[PDB]
């Protein structure tokens, strides 16, 4: 069977199992973790929290997370490897570019961005030999000309290697149509693309449209429920309405319409967050102490109460991630 690159080497597809497709170990910035580890307290304390948070998720049944932290999110793959061993949970690193690219990237052409994505997928990240197994992009509304270059190079890298592509959208936007049109003009099939953060909006026909076209619907922000008055305006902006049941009911909504094979459910959670207000992580731990165990401990039983069969959720959590992470040339 096919193999999938992890931060501990390649693993057979059958061993991925229960997989979260959009997660972060640390949401920071390029080189920030090395230069200022005291921002989190200490690098030792961040490894402790991440390892402890993953063993809690592993106890609930999670076996693999897809860390979609890219170069400009501060992806330190050695940190991803250290917590993958002490917790015994497969982690799949990513390549691509978020929406905080340093100008050493913003000045690059699409051909140059293609060679850098290919390097991290085929050669390895930095100097570790660890390769990524997924590509991450991002757009802010009407995508910038450079963001359009990024979307082009990611699809060209995906066509050469078969590695999938997952996107960042302000799900409360219609970046999906804009991202899909650029992907379709590059000849990439929608079965290798995930329009992430689709659970922010309540537009059902926008989700059904993506799935009917073959795209993977990433409902990957489940624990971000309505904040109420339990946080500042910064929290309410990034965490706010609606409730997590409203997000989880979008899984039930697509399943009832025959698109059970087009769903990927995750948390978009992290254990370190530097690209936002300070101590936002303590707010997120008040709202969700389960962390990456939220979906197995809370989302799965909530759907099961509403009459969703467990074989259907066993395909959304295991079958589709295995199908989507397998390099398809």
- Which residues here bind a copy of itself, judged by CB under 8 A? 28-32, 34-36, 38-39, 71-72, 74, 100, 102-105, 107-109, 112, 115-116, 119-120, 125-127, 274-278
Alpha helices (H) in 191-297, listed in sequence order: 204-212, 233-239, 244-256, 280-287, 294
**Partner in contact with 125, chosen from Zn ion, a copy of itself, none, beta carbon below 5 to 8 Å by kind:** a copy of itself
Three-class SS state of 328? coil
Q: How far is the CB of 68 from a copy of itself (least distance, A)?
A: 16
Q: Are 107 and 149 in contact (CB under 8 A)?
A: no
Q: Which is nearer to a copy of itself, 158 or 274 (CB)?
A: 274
Residues with Cβ within 8 Å of 268's Cβ and at least 6 positions away in sequence, in order, are: 22, 23, 24, 197, 220, 221, 224
Q: Which is nearer to a copy of itself, 93 or 217 (CB)?
A: 93
Q: Which is nearer to a copy of itself, 279 or 305 (CB)?
A: 279
d(C-alpha 122, C-alpha 93), whole Å:
13
**Residue 168 annotated as part of some ligand binding site:** yes
Q: How far is the CB of 115 from a copy of itself (least distance, A)?
A: 8
What are the backbone angles phi and psi of residue 10, rounded to the nearest 5°?
-75, 145
**Partner in contact with 168, chosen from a copy of itself, Zn ion, none, beta carbon below 5 to 8 Å by kind:** Zn ion
What tokens does 252 get?
Answer: 């039930």
Among 218, 268, 291, 297, binds Zn ion (CB under 5 A): 268
Find the angle CA(230)-CA(173)-CA(65) to the nearest 5 degrees.
70
| 168 sits near Zn ion (criterion: CB under 5 A) | yes
d(C-alpha 118, C-alpha 266), whole Å:
26
Give me the sheet containing 193-195, strands edge to edge: 95-96, 135-138, 165-168, 193-195, 216-219, 263-265
What tokens does 218 get?
Answer: 């990433």
**Partner in contact with 38, chosen from Zn ion, a copy of itself, none, beta carbon below 5 to 8 Å by kind:** a copy of itself
- Piece of 165-173, 183-191, 273-281, 283-291 that binds Zn ion (CB under 5 A): 165-173
d(C-alpha 263, C-alpha 323), whole Å:
11
Q: Which is nearer to a copy of itself, 237 or 314 (CB)?
A: 237
Q: How far is the CB of 324 from a copy of itself (least distance, A)?
A: 25
**Partner in contact with 268, chosen from Zn ion, a copy of itself, none, beta carbon below 5 to 8 Å by kind:** Zn ion
d(C-alpha 146, C-alpha 180), whole Å:
16
Q: How far is the CB of 310 from a copy of itself (least distance, A)?
A: 40
- Piece of 118-126, 157-165, 166-174, 245-253 that binds Zn ion (CB under 5 A): 166-174
> Which residues belong to the annotated binding site for Zn(2+)?
22, 24, 136, 168, 197, 268
> Which residues belong to the annotated binding site for Fe(2+)?
22, 24, 136, 268
Binding site for Zn ion (CB under 5 A): 168, 268
């Amino acid at each position: 069977g096919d193999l999938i690159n992890t931060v501990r080497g390649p693993i057979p597809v059958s061993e991925a199992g229960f997989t979260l497709t959009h997660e972060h170990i640390c949401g920071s910035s390029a080189g920030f973790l090395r230069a200022w580890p005291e921002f989190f307290g200490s690098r030792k304390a961040l490894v402790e929290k991440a390892v402890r948070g993953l063993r809690h998720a592993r106890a609930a049944g999670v076996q693999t997370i897809v860390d979609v932290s890219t170069f400009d999110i501060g992806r330190d793959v050695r940190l991803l490897a250290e917590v993958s061993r002490a917790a015994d949970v497969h982690i799949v690193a990513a390549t691509g570019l978020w929406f905080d690219p340093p100008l050493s990237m913003r000045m690059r052409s699409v051909e140059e961005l293609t060679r850098f994505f290919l390097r991290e997928i085929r050669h390895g990240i930095e100097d570790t030999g660890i390769r990524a197994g997924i590509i991450k992009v991002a757009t802010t509304g009407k995508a910038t000309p450079f963001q359009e270059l990024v979307l082009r190079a990611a699809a060209r890298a995906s066509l050469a290697t078969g590695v999938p592509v997952t996107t960042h959208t302000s799900g409360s936007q219609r970046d999906g149509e804009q991202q899909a049109a650029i992907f379709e003009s590059e000849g990439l099939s929608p079965s290798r693309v995930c329009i992430g953060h689709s659970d922010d909006t309540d537009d059902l026909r926008y989700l059904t449209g993506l799935a009917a076209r073959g795209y993977l619907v990433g409902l990957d922000r489940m624990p971000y429920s309505a904040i109420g008055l339990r946080g500042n305006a910064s929290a309410l902006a990034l965490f706010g309405t609606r409730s997590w049941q409203t997000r989880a009911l979008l899984i039930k909504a697509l399943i009832d319409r025959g698109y059970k094979d087009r769903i990927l459910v995750s948390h978009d959670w992290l254990f370190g967050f530097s690209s936002y207000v300070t101590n936002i992580m303590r707010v997120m731990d008040r709202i969700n102490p389960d962390g990456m165990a939220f979906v197995p401990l809370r989302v799965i039983p909530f759907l099961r109460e509403k009459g969703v069969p467990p074989e259907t959720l066993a395909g959304v959590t295991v079958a589709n991630p295995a199908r989507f992470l397998s390099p398809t040339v």
